[PDB]
Design an enzyme around this catalytic site. Structure first.
Site, PDB file in Angstrom:
ATOM      1  N   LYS B 217     -23.118 -18.121  46.558  1.00 43.35           N
ATOM      2  CA  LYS B 217     -23.524 -17.371  45.568  1.00 43.35           C
ATOM      3  C   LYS B 217     -23.432 -15.756  45.630  1.00 43.35           C
ATOM      4  O   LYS B 217     -23.134 -15.512  46.921  1.00 43.35           O
ATOM      5  CB  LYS B 217     -24.979 -17.731  45.110  1.00 43.35           C
ATOM      6  CG  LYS B 217     -25.279 -19.180  44.998  1.00 43.35           C
ATOM      7  CD  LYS B 217     -26.225 -19.333  43.858  1.00 43.35           C
ATOM      8  CE  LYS B 217     -26.013 -20.842  43.488  1.00 43.35           C
ATOM      9  NZ  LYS B 217     -27.388 -21.458  42.964  1.00 43.35           N
ATOM     10  N   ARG B 251     -26.181 -28.106  48.526  1.00 43.24           N
ATOM     11  CA  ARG B 251     -25.416 -28.483  47.290  1.00 43.24           C
ATOM     12  C   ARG B 251     -24.251 -27.475  47.420  1.00 43.24           C
ATOM     13  O   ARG B 251     -24.601 -26.170  47.383  1.00 43.24           O
ATOM     14  CB  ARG B 251     -26.053 -28.323  46.004  1.00 43.24           C
ATOM     15  CG  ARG B 251     -24.983 -28.206  44.826  1.00 43.24           C
ATOM     16  CD  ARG B 251     -26.167 -28.266  43.457  1.00 43.24           C
ATOM     17  NE  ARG B 251     -24.985 -28.174  42.331  1.00 43.24           N
ATOM     18  CZ  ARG B 251     -24.262 -26.997  42.119  1.00 43.24           C
ATOM     19  NH1 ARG B 251     -24.854 -26.068  42.700  1.00 43.24           N
ATOM     20  NH2 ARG B 251     -23.491 -26.984  40.939  1.00 43.24           N
TER      21      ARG B 251
HETATM   22  C1  LIG Z   1     -24.918 -22.366  40.044  1.00 47.15           C
HETATM   23  C2  LIG Z   1     -25.628 -23.741  40.349  1.00 47.15           C
HETATM   24  C3  LIG Z   1     -25.571 -24.703  39.162  1.00 47.15           C
HETATM   25  N1  LIG Z   1     -26.438 -25.866  39.486  1.00 47.15           N
HETATM   26  C4  LIG Z   1     -27.168 -25.668  40.358  1.00 47.15           C
HETATM   27  N2  LIG Z   1     -28.173 -26.832  40.807  1.00 47.15           N
HETATM   28  C5  LIG Z   1     -29.040 -26.829  41.832  1.00 47.15           C
HETATM   29  N3  LIG Z   1     -29.847 -27.715  41.726  1.00 47.15           N
HETATM   30  N4  LIG Z   1     -29.251 -25.782  42.465  1.00 47.15           N
HETATM   31  C6  LIG Z   1     -28.471 -24.814  42.496  1.00 47.15           C
HETATM   32  O1  LIG Z   1     -28.631 -23.669  43.288  1.00 47.15           O
HETATM   33  C7  LIG Z   1     -27.276 -24.788  41.385  1.00 47.15           C
HETATM   34  N5  LIG Z   1     -26.662 -23.699  41.352  1.00 47.15           N
END
Ligand SMILES: C=C1CN=c2nc(N)[nH]c(=O)c2=N1
Ligand SMILES: C=C1CN=c2nc(N)[nH]c(=O)c2=N1
Lengths: 271, 271
Positions: B217, B251
């Site tokens: 990120k 994740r």
């Molecule tokens: C960029 C994304 C797309 N989907 C996500 N989904 C979850 N649960 N957590 C995230 O940090 C997340 N980042």
């Protein structure tokens, strides 16, 4: 948090702004041999680590193999002194000397080294604390012992560390010249090694900066089941938990990688 | 610690033995196009991650670019359904569907997916909780909001998360089907993102498993000052602190690397 700075001759290390990275420079002879090749190769690696984010260079010529040669004291001085003289001349960074021998440290400082890194915590040659006394350098006292009889790991570790601090203090060392190290990978089963990691925070009540040395160590191997050249992620993990547990130094081989991780933790833990 | 298991159709996830790795499978079309090339490439990447240590596959076709195409609901189903059908057939691993749309999730489960991953925490289409209700799947409720007005970050995060849990519960979702996520990288300045990391542990008092999504990120970028393809160490660091703070899922994009780090933490924290 720390109301003082670590004073190393011309260099000054701040213990509050970031986790300080100690770069490992392994200078242990693999055969009986000073020559350009070695010294030159040590310099370029020191320069690399400086470029990669290192704040300290740890020169040691007593690594315990396999493949390294048994080296007598007067031989180690002849080998490790030139290394120190060149590195400190071309790499503007404080240098620690990784020895438990008193006469080695003496000559290492004389040759330009700033910190003593004692893997026996003044217990092997208490004289080393007097050398630390005289030249007024920081000394790193590592937990170590000649057996694995632990009643209670952390309590016994803390006790041993204090016995070390005592030897240090009685010889003349000031509080601000003392750094502590849990000695991960020393006289600890893989299980104790983990425990000591899990409980690192306790060393903080002693009131000294703590340095952590877990880079590439076997206990990472045992957990992850991976050879020495595949322990970056493992090492990483230890460095992260070590910083979250309040360490101020980490002693590592992969300076580039570890430096970014240390930087990311500092931001998160608010250092 | 957890007195239950996460029930996903034929798969069963244990929340106590190890930190569970969620592999990111990005399936978002970069142009209007089902064809072998795409589906095949998604399968091989899923297989890779399975080999690399992943315990869950997160298929999402709503990534927000740059370079990705705007996709209507009926279009996303046609694209993401084949992906699900093939992966779950050739990769024996539970699959989550990364959407906030209700009609998408419906079809994704029907097509063989086991977990819902809602980035709006049922707030965008509360209907999604009813879908979660009916098929009796685990749903991941992420913290998110349409503004950045925070009185107190953690307190407000926890409040929003509960408003989500409420919508979930009122629609029929059982407690054991609820996973929480701080939504790092969502409606949080780089500074709040850090704060939320530093204070993750607080989410634990809600009594739900927490999943962390910090892989690659931007806030890692901002701290380390590094582009998206150089955030492995940063990501690493976040995963370590997240696990030390008590997370049960992470994740991530770099399944191989992250899996070893998660493994090293589990040993240290005694999982
Ligand atoms: C960029 C994304 C797309 N989907 C996500 N989904 C979850 N649960 N957590 C995230 O940090 C997340 N980042
Ligand atoms: C293998 C080694 C050699 N020297 C060391 N020195 C310190 N201070 N700490 C260590 O963990 C350490 N490991």
């Amino acid at each position: 948090k720390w109301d003082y700075d670590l004073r190393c001759g011309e260099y000054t290390l701040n213990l509050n702004e970031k986790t300080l990275i100690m770069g490992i420079l392994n200078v242990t002879p693999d055969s009986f041999s000073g020559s350009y090749n070695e010294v030159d190769a040590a310099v370029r690696h020191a320069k690399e680590m400086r470029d990669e984010g290192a704040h300290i260079i740890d020169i040691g010529g007593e690594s315990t193999r396999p493949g390294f040669a048994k080296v007598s004291v007067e031989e180690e001085i002849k080998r490790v002194v030139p290394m120190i003289q060149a590195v400190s001349k071309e790499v503007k960074l404080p240098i620690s000397i990784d020895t438990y021998k008193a006469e080695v440290a003496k000559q290492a400082i004389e040759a330009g080294a700033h910190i003593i890194n004692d893997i026996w915590g003044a217990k092997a040659e208490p004289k080393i604390a007097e050398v630390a006394a005289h030249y007024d350098v920081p000394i790193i006292l590592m937990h170590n012992r000649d057996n694995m009889n632990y009643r209670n790991l952390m309590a016994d570790m803390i006790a041993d560390l204090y016995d070390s601090i005592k030897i240090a203090k009685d010889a003349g060392v000031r509080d601000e010249n003392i750094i502590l190290d849990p000695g991960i990978g020393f006289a600890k089963t893989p299980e104790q090694n983990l425990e000591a990691m899990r409980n690192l925070e306790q060393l903080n009540v002693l009131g000294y900066p703590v340095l952590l040395g877990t880079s590439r160590k076997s206990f990472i191997g045992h957990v992850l089941d991976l050879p020495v050249e595949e322990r970056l992620e493992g090492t990483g993990a230890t460095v992260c938990l070590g910083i979250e547990k309040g360490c101020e130094f980490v002693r590592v081989h992969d300076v580039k990688e570890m430096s970014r991780m240390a930087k990311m933790m500092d931001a998160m833990i608010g250092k």
